Curated annotation (Swiss-Prot):
It is found in: Cell membrane; Synapse; Cell projection, Dendrite. Disulfide bonds join 19-31, 34-47. Belongs to the G-protein coupled receptor 3 family. Glycans are attached at residue 41. Detected in brain cortex (at protein level). Widely expressed in different regions of the adult brain as well as in fetal brain. This is Metabotropic glutamate receptor 2. Dimeric G protein-coupled receptor which is activated by the excitatory neurotransmitter L-glutamate. Plays critical roles in modulating synaptic transmission and neuronal excitability. Upon activation by glutamate, inhibits presynaptic calcium channels, reducing further glutamate release and dampening excitatory signaling. Mechanistically, ligand binding causes a conformation change that triggers signaling via guanine nucleotide-binding proteins (G proteins) and modulates the activity of down-stream effectors, such as adenylate cyclase. (Microbial infection) Plays an important role in influenza virus internalization. It comes from Homo sapiens (Human). Forms heterodimers with GRM3 or GRM4. Interacts with TAMALIN. Interacts with HTR2A. (Microbial infection) Interacts with H5N6 virus protein HA. The chain holds residues 507 to 568 of 872 of the full protein.
Length: 62
């Protein structure tokens, strides 16, 4: 969950740091999701963002 390992040396206490929410975070060392793809998450299950429009007809600013 937004945390990925860094150190490629010792296989016992590799230095692990958090990975940014707009990253890939699928492999251990990868991160770096596709540019301008799915901002929240793009490697677990279809976490595509939504273009929230002004159409609500019940919203505060509607």
């Amino acid at each position: 969950n937004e945390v990925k390992s860094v150190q490629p040396g010792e296989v016992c206490c590799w230095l692990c740091i958090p990975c940014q929410p707009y990253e890939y975070r699928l492999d251990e060392f990868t991160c770096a999701d596709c540019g301008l793809g799915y901002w929240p998450n793009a490697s677990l299950t279809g976490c595509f963002e939504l273009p929230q429009e002004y159409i609500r007809w019940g919203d505060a600013w509607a």
